[PDB]
Amino acid sequence: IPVIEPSVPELVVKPGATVTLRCVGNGSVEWDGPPSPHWTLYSDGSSSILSTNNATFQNTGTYRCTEPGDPLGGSAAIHLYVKDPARPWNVLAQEVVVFEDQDALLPCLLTDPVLEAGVSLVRVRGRPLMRHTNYSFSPWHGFTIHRAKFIQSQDYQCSALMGGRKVMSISIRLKVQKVIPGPPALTLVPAELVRIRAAQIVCSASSVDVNFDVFLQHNNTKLAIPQQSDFHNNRYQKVLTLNLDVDFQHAGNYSCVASNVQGKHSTSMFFRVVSAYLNLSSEQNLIQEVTVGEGLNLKVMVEAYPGLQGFNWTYLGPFSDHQPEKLANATTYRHTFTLSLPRLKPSEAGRYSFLARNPGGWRALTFELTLRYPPEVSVIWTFGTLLCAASGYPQPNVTWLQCLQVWDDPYPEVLSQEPFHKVTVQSLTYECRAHNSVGSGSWAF
């Protein structure tokens, strides 16, 4: 740590006096203090000297010496009072700005340390300090208001008790600022919207401070909407309410944007214009083929406006009409309807229709569920010619076995091709085996 001579906490001098501050370290050192006139500076390798021949009131303040290049070295300080008459105070600044819950130093320097026992902080026009003002005093620095609040943004004065009369410093304006984190908090709702050729869009922004803008813009052309403004829960609100009692020219990209001294913030939504609609679709093919015993989920996606007034699943399957209930749904303008068909039994094959209805009409999507066919074999002797059949979808082959010998028969002469049946094939002991992507079959005569 550097060493200051004289080894005294403070000095008190008259205007015109000569003051010489000397600092010494191991490495180079440098002085910092009040920006003041008539200071001469002498410096070499290890020491540095401040000196003046005409000391003035502006020279009043703390002079701190540090040794750069020594890290964590620390500093040494000394306070200079230049008691310019009559004049107990040397105010360094008439304006101070801080944020809430910070200490606020009011830099009125006392020109005579013995006065400290009789000093106080007041407001202009003799008014008293605001209620619950936490503050303390240091002769070298001035009054510090601890954990400053917005309410304490006032014009202050330093009081010194001299010969009974309290003598005031010049006024000092304190600015306490609310800690404003960022741009105004936006709330644009609804995030999604779609109507037939009423709707409502409310752009809102809120900050602890009033000084902030907010605008709602259609596309990049801002709309002229009168904003409702109110103060609640210690926060300012500013709400732009758009009412469309609608058409195709109103649809588009509504951006809600608010700005302040911090910066600009933006949020947005999309507005679509369709009359009432109801569109049904599936990621799945309507023609379904699954093996018996397998589970299947039939899913339909429904984009509808206004809300659906009814929906169901119906078994048109030929097998006895046990009706779904089975049916579940997730997502409100979008919906997915899922009919669960676990461990499919053979009577569950057939047609399943999903129907949905709203003010726009009704729509249906019908699935056709065929269960796997396994190769089924029929061999007859006719006139010297044997005739085998083998059966299933998809289209099978045939493996003949004399069991000695084998003939194989991949895509035979076709017996039945018609939609929604088995794909029939005809082949002209004789073991006649059948294999498709479905399975193994055989017969012996």
Partner: protein
Amino acid sequence: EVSEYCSHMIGSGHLQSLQRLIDSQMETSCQITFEFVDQEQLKDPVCYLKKAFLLVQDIMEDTMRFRDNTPNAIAIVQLQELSLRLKSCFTKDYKACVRTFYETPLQLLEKVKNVFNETKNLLDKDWNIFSKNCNNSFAEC
């Protein structure tokens, strides 16, 4: 520092807090003395409010005192923060031109409420109203 945000600054919530504060007060015949702008010397609506707004500051500190952390006390604090924000909307130059009053606390509260209410009304019509020099108005006093 005057800005287009001189409106939107006095919210209805502020006025509600005042009203609730007024409604909570006991109706008594007691009178209190306080300094306030004289309507006679200032018939001008815009320059009346200008002089009043400054005086309301001292009123809320000196007269409108409530127990700490009570709803009314909090309301007063907010109105005081509001008044700091309302600063830089009122342009001003060099006291006086005022008269001593002797009225009930409720009447005082009605005056203060009227100051805040009418100021909100005018700022809604035009936010740059109170930026006029009333030195000429303050002469006829």
